[PDB]
């Protein structure tokens, strides 16, 4: 991706987590276990349903539309009639198919850049206290309850108070 | 948005139903929506809801084998079968808006109600 | 116009043809009317109807030519016809054409079919010496749109 | 004149044989209108249409 987030530095996705898009994975001495982040997830949700139903919007439904007959004596107004015919549905064949194919690139872009914001929102907050191992992993120097990572996964993680 | 359920039922034992529930707005919705039942004379009682997305349904341990919740998602209907009718499925059906994608218990919009009886 | 009552003095049954069969006899359409001679005689004719059904009238009708002059005396007993048919809107004269030409279903003369459409309250005239095949069923049209006329061989 | 032309003319069907009579003594008549890429001839139809 344009983001280099998925499979990028972050190779691979969690099969058990199940409940979201995007979330988190800990581990302490209480137990593991993941958990979905539900604003990145409701805004992500948003914007694709934002979508779909724009590009259902811009296309309008198709009334009666049935052929008409010519005799041997008419035929350039016939040719004239199929010319009409074939040039719109080729031109509406074209708009649809490119329409489709440049929005699917976008839309895979999207969650690449979702998933690059919450990892620099979280390095933001840890900046000293954690040490950066790769995967989009932080281990931590002190110990880290279940308060603390809630805090953690909340956006109010206390600096000064773990030094 | 608006909620709007479909006609008055009713039925004799041993059979099914069908309910559905239309909603105002573009065809795609980012909020789940749930099912609430309640008797006359007592309190509502929650059967089952469904997720925009994810596709996902939950239902209460009670109505676990008889309740079927489904989607359409391009109509903008969702669809709710109740099987093997007995004498106490005849109560009012609420179709309730939740506000996020989850099924929370917070349910901000209501219908207006639809009547099952059973005999 | 009712059969019979409209034509006292031409004869309202025996134009019937072997190029349009029904159960292995002579036939002819239904919603039109072939006339002829009545003894030796066709008098001039002279017909008229006004629209009072509030809606739009679609009448037909047709005309014939012959292949000789004999088969034109034994049919009309006129050698020089003609037709009028005159609306508000609408007017034309038709005069035969008695040629030999190519067989098509047994026949060497041929039919010219013409439609017209008369609107609430109006008028429409049949004048003819000859050669007429005159409207017997007439069809007050109610529009609409949604419609159509499709080609298809699936089943119904 | 050295422009193009515009001319314009019409032709009359009575009703009967007397107002032809009154109206140009002959019963036979014709109208012949011709150009270099023009050319037609007119003959009466004389019927009785209903009334405008
Ligand atoms: C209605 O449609 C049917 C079916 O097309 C017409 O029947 C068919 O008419 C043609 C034209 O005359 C017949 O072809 C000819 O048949 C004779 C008799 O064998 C043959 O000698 C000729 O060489 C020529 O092939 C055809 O046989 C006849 N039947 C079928 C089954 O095709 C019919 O005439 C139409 N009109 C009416 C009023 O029924
Ligand atoms: C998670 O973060 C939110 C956002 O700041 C916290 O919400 C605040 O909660 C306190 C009470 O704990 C209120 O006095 C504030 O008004 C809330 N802020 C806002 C913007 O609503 C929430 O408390 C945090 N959760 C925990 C467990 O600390």
């Given at each position: 991706?344009?983001?280099?987030?998925?499979?990028?530095?972050?190779?691979?996705?969690?099969?058990?987590?199940?409940?979201?898009?995007?979330?988190?994975?800990?581990?302490?001495?209480?137990?593991?276990?993941?958990?979905?982040?539900?604003?990145?997830?409701?805004?992500?949700?948003?914007?694709?349903?934002?979508?779909?139903?724009?590009?259902?919007?811009?296309?309008?439904?198709?009334?009666?539309?049935?052929?008409?007959?010519?005799?041997?004596?008419?035929?350039?107004?016939?040719?004239?009639?199929?010319?009409?015919?074939?040039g719109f549905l080729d031109i509406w064949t074209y708009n649809a198919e490119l329409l489709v194919l440049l929005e699917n690139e976008r839309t895979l872009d999207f969650h690449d850049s979702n998933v690059k914001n919450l990892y620099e929102k979280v390095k933001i907050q840890l900046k000293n206290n954690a040490k950066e191992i790769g995967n989009g992993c932080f281990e931590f120097y002190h110990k880290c309850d279940n308060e603390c990572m809630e805090s953690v996964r909340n956006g109010t993680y206390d600096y000064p108070k773990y030094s | 948005v608006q909620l709007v359920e479909s006609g008055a039922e009713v039925k004799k034992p041993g059979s099914s139903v069908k309910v559905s529930c239309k909603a105002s707005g573009g065809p795609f919705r980012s909020y789940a929506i749930?099912?609430?039942?309640?008797?006359?004379?007592?309190?509502?009682?929650?059967?089952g809801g469904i997720i925009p997305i994810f596709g996902t349904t939950?239902?209460?341990?009670?109505?676990?084998?008889?309740?079927?919740?489904?989607?359409?998602?391009?109509?903008?209907?969702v669809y709710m079968e109740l099987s093997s009718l007995r004498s106490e499925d005849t109560a009012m059906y609420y179709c309730a808006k939740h506000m996020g994608y989850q099924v929370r218990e917070t349910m901000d919009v209501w219908g207006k109600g639809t009547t099952v009886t059973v005999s | 116009f009712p059969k019979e009552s409209s034509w006292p003095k031409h004869s309202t049954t025996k134009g019937v043809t072997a190029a349009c069969s029904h159960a292995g006899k002579s036939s002819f359409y239904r919603n039109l009317?072939?006339?002829?001679?009545?003894?030796?005689?066709?008098?001039?004719?002279?017909?008229?109807?006004?629209?009072?059904?509030?809606?739009?009238?679609?009448?037909?009708?047709?005309?014939?030519?012959?292949?000789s002059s004999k088969e034109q005396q034994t049919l009309y007993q006129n050698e020089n016809a003609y037709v009028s048919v005159v609306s508000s809107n609408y007017?034309?004269?038709?005069?035969?054409?008695?040629?030999?030409?190519?067989?098509?279903?047994?026949?060497?003369?041929?039919?010219?079919?013409?439609?017209?459409?008369?609107?609430?309250?109006?008028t429409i005239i049949f004048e003819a010496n000859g050669n007429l095949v005159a409207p017997w069923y007439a069809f007050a049209l109610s529009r609409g749109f949604g419609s159509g006329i499709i080609t298809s061989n699936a089943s119904m």
């Open positions: 991706g344009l983001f280099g987030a998925i499979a990028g530095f972050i190779e691979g996705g969690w099969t058990g987590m199940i409940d979201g898009w995007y979330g988190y994975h800990h581990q302490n001495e209480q137990g593991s276990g993941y958990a979905a982040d539900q604003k990145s997830t409701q805004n992500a949700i948003n914007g694709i349903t934002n979508k779909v139903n724009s590009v259902i919007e811009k296309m309008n439904t198709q009334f009666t539309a049935v052929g008409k007959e010519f005799n041997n004596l008419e035929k350039r107004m016939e040719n004239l009639n199929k010319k009409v015919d074939d | 749930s099912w609430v039942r309640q008797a006359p004379g007592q309190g509502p009682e929650w059967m939950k239902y209460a341990p009670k109505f676990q084998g008889r309740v079927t919740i489904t989607a359409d998602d391009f109509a903008g209907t | 009317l072939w006339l002829t001679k009545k003894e030796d005689s066709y008098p001039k004719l002279s017909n008229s109807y006004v629209n009072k059904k509030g809606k739009e009238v679609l009448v037909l009708w047709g005309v014939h030519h012959p292949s007017n034309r004269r038709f005069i035969p054409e008695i040629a030999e030409r190519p067989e098509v279903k047994d026949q060497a003369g041929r039919i010219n079919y013409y439609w017209t459409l008369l609107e609430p309250g109006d």
